[PDB]
Structures are given as C-alpha cells and as structure tokens.
Structure 1
C-alpha cells in the first residue's frame, strides 16, 4: 500500500503503459463549445501577456472574455446573443444532439492515440458527469446525459486508456471578476474552505465512479486543499497502482510534468517523463474562427510528435468538438493524417526510449531526431531529403549496419570525420511519407 505522505507516494513512478503510449487525445468540450468563438491571436508564449486575456485565443475562456466589457468576445456576444443572455444559458443549448461516443473512440484509435482525456469540469465549473455536488452538470442540463461515463465506456471498449481532466485551480461559479492580467490569478480564485472541499469531493467522486488511468489537474490546487492530496493520491494509487497524476497540483508529487505550447517546452532531453499539450489550432475549445491558417498541418503534427518523443515526452493533442458533439472536419482530417503516418512508422515511436541525444541535422539544414528500442536506433528526419547523399553533422556511429526503415534495405554509410555519411537510393527516398526514417543497429 501507499501511505498518505509525500515520502511514501514518491515510491510510485510513471507507469509503463503511459511511458510507452507516446500519444494521447485531449478533449476540451463544454458549454463554451456552443458559442465556439475566440479571436485566434497566436500561440501561448508568443502573445504578450498584457493583451492575452483581452484577446484570448482559448475559446474555452469565453466566459472570462465575456466578463471583460468591450473585449472582442463581449461585442461578439452582445450582437449574436444579446446582453440579456447570460453565459450559463449555454448549458441549456448544449445538447450533444449528434454525439456518438463509439464514433469518437473509433476515430481516436485510427488516429494512433492510446489514451483519451476529456475535460470533466473546465474553468466555467460546468460538470460533464452526474456529480452530486452541483446541479450545474450535463445530466441535469443540456445533454441530459453522463458524458464522462459514456465516453469512458466507449474508450475502454476500443482498448484505449481513459483519464480525466479537472479544473482544480479555477472555477468561475465561485468568482465574479474576470482575469485581466496574469497577476490577477494570484488573488481571483474561489479561495474558500468550501471550494477546497468541493474540489476534493469532485475528484474523489471521479475516482470512485470511473477509476481513471490519469488524474490531469489544471491551474494548480486550492492552497487550503493541498494537504488533502496526500490522502487523495494514496486512495487513488491503492485502488489503481497503474493510475497516474500530472504536475499541476502544486504539491511535491507528480508522475509526469507538462508543457503547453511554448511554455516549459524542453530544447533537449529533460531528465524526467513529461507530456506536451496543444490544440490542433490555437485554442483548446472549438473555435469557428480558426481556419487551416491557424492549424498545424499533418506534416507539422508529425514533426511535433517526433520532437516530443525523442525528448522522452508524450504528446496529448487536443480536439475541440462542437456543441452538437461532432468533430470539425479540419480536425478530423489532421487526426487521420497523423493516424496514417503512425500506421507506417509507429514501431519507431510506441515503446521507444530516448537515446544519448535527441537531436541532429544534415549539412543542408534538415532537422533529425532519434529514438531507441534496445540496440535499435531510429533516425527520423523531419522531412525527406532530395539528394541520395546525406551528410549528418556531428555524428559518428559504431553500429556497422544502417537500414532504411520501411523497406528494411541495408544502406551504405561511413563516419567521415566529425560527420556521418549515408547514401539513400532515391527509390527508397520515394517510398517514405513525411519523414525519411532510418534504423541503425
């Protein structure tokens, strides 16, 4: 058993399944999906924080944006819905009329994901399961249905792991003033003992009803409730040792860390297990304002996954469904594009470990990443070189044998000084899809 103390809970490390899974699907879905609107300003870490909340690209932040008068959201809202239309009202419009959890699960499985994590409660406080601690939930309003439970059953039937996201650090049902600047986050929070009990009871409830594979908390945990996590974590691990928690609780324990868009993104091997998350575009919740110009292309998604994995991370790619429960076409295509690439190259991703180094590049500027499976080293190019002669800078191999991954064809190579030279027959180079992949042994 795990005891309720940080020294004991440290005994639990990231489970194997999670380390080997490499790719998961995040799902931000709630009543904010109904208006599904945000100004696609840019990526977190690139937009100046003094403007960020006033032109928030996270459509799931709609309510906070609505609370800032004369913010693009306020104007959009007043003209589309009217001023006598409270944000809460969207809970009744959220009907998930076309939702089919098995179709979602089929899709995430085809895309190559091995786990799925929906938002059980985001910052607006709306709950997607029939919780008994609030009536502001999907069973009582809108969908008239236990979205979390139903999705978990479908995901698990498809053979994928199932986790839960819970906004522990923020709940706008307990505050009135919006977040205008990053500094505001230091005092505009529920702040009460009552809220801390609520959060604790809600996560314990999720654990008892669905025994998730991952407890993904966001925005930190209520200061008054931090001590509670020793008990919660021990309770959780003792019922599910292969369970896992992220690092957004603000306490000593975590099984894996996180990075969001540019924030805390590592440039080289970090030394611990971590997970990258971002939307296919610039938002997590659905944004009808985004076009393909704001989204990553299938090629960019593949290069992102490879970069992340060579660095020991897992990619948790977010999908932003519509209020009716359908997944926009732009998103579905990119999920599929990635699933296709993974069907061909998956063996150099799933189940791999990091190598001595994560990165390299060809004399001509083509970026390279490495992954490993025992004695096999995968050399993954972020693109496909034009010429048959490939010069990798600052790299020497002691393998003696280097094959072209898809075909398995042995290739010719030699360490020329501080570099490594390989000849890749154009026929092979033409077989690869987005990345030229080599395997050294």
Structure 2
C-alpha cells in the first residue's frame, strides 16, 4: 500500500539530529553508566542536585540541527536512568522541576524546533532503572510509562513524534502497546511513533542497523506501510564520553547518511551534550562537515527515493529518484591533478547503471554544475557516465550527478 501522509512527510525529513542529555552527562562516562558501572542508585540520583542546565540553549540545539541539514530532532526526555527533563506534573520527584534548573527543557525544546521549522521528537526509555515498579510491578510500571508519555502528549501542543527504547529488555512481556499508542493517537494523531527493537499496528517506523545492506522492509503487501530509520553516534557512546577518542571519520558519517537514503530509510546522527547542556565542540565539527554535504545534496536528500536502478559490478554507486529527476550517487572518486601531478581522478571514469529506459538530455554534478558525458542503450536500459574526479581542493565523499530528461 501507499504510506500514510505523516509517514510520507517523515520520509521527506531524511536526516534527524539525536541529542543525548541526562544526569549521566555530568559524569562524561556514557549514558549507561549507572548500570554498567554498578553505581549506588541513591548516590547516582544525587546528580539531580547539580543539574543546572546552565549552558542549555534550545535555540543553539535547533540551530545546530538546521546547519547540519536535519529536519527533526530527537531529544532524550527520559533515559534508562529514569530522570525526566520535563515537568511530570506530580508523577515523579525525579524531574527537572526538582533540580536547580527549574525549567521545562522539553517546552524550550519544542519552541526552538518550531521556530526553525523542525519537528520535535521525544525519546522515551521504556526500560527504567529509577522506579521500583519496573521490576516489582510491571503492570503498574506500564501505567507509569504511559502517564509519562501522556504528559508529553498533552502539555506541549503538536509533537512530531515519539521514539521508544527498551522493550527489548523484556522480549516476552505484554507491553500494552494498543493502549499506549492508542493514547498517543488520541492526543497526537499525526505524531510519528518509532519503536527501537512491527510490534503494533500503530508503529510508523522501524529501526535498523546502519550496516543493513539491502532496501528496508516496508510491511506485507496488504498491510500498513512502515518507514525505516538508521542511527549513528560519532564515537562509541551516545551520552558524552570524555575519554572515548574513537570517533568515526566525517567521511564515514557522510557515507552512512547517503546509505540510509539508498536503502529507503531516514538517519539520526547523535550528539551527547555536556552535563550542563552544551553542544561539545567536537560535535560542532561533524555538524559543519556533514552540513556542507547536506547543503550540496539538498535537491535529492529529502525527496529522493530508492528506485530499481542498479550500479555496475564492483561499484558502490546508487540512484535516487524524485518526480522530476534521477540522481547518481557516486562513491570512490579521487581528486584530479595535472599531467605531471597525478592525484588519481584524472582518467576517464565510466560508471554504469541499469534500469534507465528514458532518453536523457543532460547530466551535471550538483557541487559545481559540470556537465558530464554519457551514453545510453535504451533497449537494455544502460547508462554510462564519465564520472569526472574532484576539482583539486575539494572532496565530497559522495558526489551527486543530477539527470535531466528530454
């Protein structure tokens, strides 16, 4: 079937920014610290006393997303640690209104998203380490969880979506999703519901591993269409981790964003804020670099969809389709030098594709408007382009050629 309108709109977002921020951030040793480091719960939960949010500016967060070319932001409203970054209106004492911050961060967040035309999404951990209900009274925990979501559904106006994480902790339990998701549909009919593991008809989006090779499953031929989403964090941790030096290359990040679109998914890129809610400078660097790429890729990043056009043997190239154009996404290009300074990209570089049966008028690189030479066999639907290398002084990692039809 056809995607519901809100899921079409979701797939058009393309790229989101994931933001991890909680009490864990003050320790800068990763978001699972309370459990994995076997911390004393009483002592860990005292971090609420120093949660000032002194450097959280939701406008700067929203601006970061805008600059990277993201169209939505997923904020951690409550992680496994169980601390709420919003006013739970009496549900819990373990929330930002009982911290020196005394600010509803979610309220600030939603306002900042709307000012930048971004959808606000709320991450909610369903595996909870704070409330004894989780282990001691799971049905009552489900009521608590659902109430926590109800607050997010009812106090902030329209919400882009919800991002649930933790049902995997009790794979065999009845999580009462008809009632949780049904409550969401009542207050937030157009919210996107994402469950990180379909576990319920009301799910709109399924999550996958970034190295999923093949196109995404969209559901059975006569069932509801569900979108897909991949996630990457810049190092090994999601929350800030000061001694995690194992950052990915910006090149891998770009390739992963491209790859998401290739397989018909969205992608979240994650940053972990500091204890006080600042975007770390390391993250800003990744945002600037990916942001250059996404600005260049704008004509296809959002509306582009996978299409049955494959690339030749031995190539990682791929094709994205919009209603007016096809786009060749071309990888493993090298920089062009001279006759006596050779950087690798100077030879004619035929890249082929199978599945285009219409005569083409023009093909051009989005980065510099260079027109490419090509040949077609329309009977067998072959396209071969001379994919010229990068002008010296540039390297886009994934280069994009726009096809214009006759």
State if a TM-score over 0.5 links the two structures.
yes
Which residue of structure 2 aligns with residue 51 of structure 1? none
Aligned-pair CA distance for 1:204: 1.1
Q: CA 1:284–1:328 in 2, change beyond 3 Å: closer, same or farther? A: same
Name the CA distance, whole Å, in 2 between partners of 1:323 and 1:205: 25
Structure 1 counterpart of 2:182, from 234, 254, 266: 234
Name the CA distance, whole Å, in 2 between partners of 1:225 and 1:125: 21
Name the CA distance, whole Å, in 2 between partners of 1:382 and 1:190: 53
Structure 2 counterpart of 1:336, from 277, 282, 288: 288
| 1:308-348 deviation per Cα after TM superposition (whole angstroms, max 9, x unaligned) | 01111000111100002111111111011111111112112
Q: CA 1:195–1:158 in 2, change beyond 3 Å: closer, same or farther? A: same
Aligned-pair CA distance for 1:394: 6.2
Q: CA 1:189–1:354 in 2, change beyond 3 Å: closer, same or farther? A: farther
Name the CA distance, whole Å, in 2 between partners of 1:25 and 1:97: 22
| 1:264-296 deviation per Cα after TM superposition (whole angstroms, max 9, x unaligned) | x343343452000121111110110122xx222
Q: Are the equivalent residues in 1 in contact too, given 2:18–2:73 (CA < 8 A)? A: yes
2:163 paired with 1:216 = yes
Of residues 316-325 and 380-389 in structure 1, the stretch that sits farther from structure 2 once superposed is 380-389
Aligned-pair CA distance for 1:248: 3.8
Q: CA 1:348–1:214 in 2, change beyond 3 Å: closer, same or farther? A: same
Q: What does 1:417-428 correspond to in 2, within 5 Å?
A: 420-425=383-388
Structure 1 counterpart of 2:266, from 304, 314, 321: 314
Give TM-score scaled by structure 1 length: 0.77
2:32 paired with 1:61 = yes
Structure 1: 5+ residue stretches without partners:
1-9, 38-58, 68-73, 75-82, 177-187
Q: Are the equivalent residues in 1 in contact too, given 2:353–2:384 (CA < 8 A)? A: no
Name the CA distance, whole Å, in 1 between partners of 2:389 and 2:195: 46
Which residue of structure 1 aligns with residue 402 of structure 2? 439
Q: Are the equivalent residues in 2 in contact too, given 1:31–1:126 (CA < 8 A)? A: yes
Which residue of structure 1 aligns with residue 364 of structure 2? 404
Q: Are the equivalent residues in 2 in contact too, given 1:14–1:256 (CA < 8 A)? A: no
Which residue of structure 2 aligns with residue 277 of structure 1? 231
Structure 2: 5+ residue stretches without partners:
219-225, 335-344
2:54 paired with 1:108 = no
2:354 paired with 1:395 = yes
Name the CA distance, whole Å, in 1 between partners of 2:20 and 2:263: 26
Q: Are the equivalent residues in 1 in contact too, given 2:178–2:200 (CA < 8 A)? A: no
Q: Are the equivalent residues in 1 in contact too, given 2:16–2:72 (CA < 8 A)? A: yes
Name the CA distance, whole Å, in 2 between partners of 1:11 and 1:297: 34
| 1:16-75 deviation per Cα after TM superposition (whole angstroms, max 9, x unaligned) | 3211010001111100001011xxxxxxxxxxxxxxxxxxxxx110001121xxxxxx7x
Q: CA 1:224–1:65 in 2, change beyond 3 Å: closer, same or farther? A: closer
Aligned-pair CA distance for 1:428: 6.3
Q: What does 1:52-91 correspond to in 2, within 5 Å?
A: 59-67=30-38, 86-91=43-48
Q: Are the equivalent residues in 2 in contact too, given 1:171–1:189 (CA < 8 A)? A: no
**CA RMSD after TM alignment:** 3.0
Aligned-pair CA distance for 1:391: 2.8
Which residue of structure 1 aligns with residue 105 of structure 2? 147
Name the CA distance, whole Å, in 1 between partners of 2:353 and 2:331: 17
Q: CA 1:426–1:295 in 2, change beyond 3 Å: closer, same or farther? A: closer
Which residue of structure 2 aligns with residue 174 of structure 1? 131
Q: CA 1:421–1:66 in 2, change beyond 3 Å: closer, same or farther? A: same
Name the CA distance, whole Å, in 1 between partners of 2:273 and 2:308: 39
Aligned-pair CA distance for 1:425: 4.9
Aligned residues: 377
Q: CA 1:390–1:420 in 2, change beyond 3 Å: closer, same or farther? A: farther
Q: Are the equivalent residues in 2 in contact too, given 1:171–1:190 (CA < 8 A)? A: no
Name the CA distance, whole Å, in 1 between partners of 2:173 and 2:297: 47
Q: CA 1:14–1:274 in 2, change beyond 3 Å: closer, same or farther? A: farther
Give TM-score scaled by structure 2 length: 0.83
Q: Are the equivalent residues in 2 in contact too, given 1:124–1:171 (CA < 8 A)? A: yes
Please state whether the residue corresponding to 1:16 is helix, strand or coil.
Answer: helix
Q: Are the equivalent residues in 2 in contact too, given 1:391–1:420 (CA < 8 A)? A: no
Which residue of structure 2 aligns with residue 204 of structure 1? 150
Q: Are the equivalent residues in 2 in contact too, given 1:383–1:436 (CA < 8 A)? A: no
Name the CA distance, whole Å, in 2 between partners of 1:317 and 1:288: 18
Please state whether the residue corresponding to 1:281 is helix, strand or coil.
Answer: coil
Which residue of structure 1 aligns with residue 222 of structure 2? none
Q: CA 1:425–1:88 in 2, change beyond 3 Å: closer, same or farther? A: closer
Q: CA 1:14–1:383 in 2, change beyond 3 Å: closer, same or farther? A: farther
Structure with higher strand content: 2
| 1:149-194 deviation per Cα after TM superposition (whole angstroms, max 9, x unaligned) | 11111111111110101111x1111359xxxxxxxxxxx8455222
Q: Are the equivalent residues in 1 in contact too, given 2:356–2:382 (CA < 8 A)? A: no
Name the CA distance, whole Å, in 1 between partners of 2:155 and 2:14: 26
| 1:405-428 deviation per Cα after TM superposition (whole angstroms, max 9, x unaligned) | 324444321258997432245586
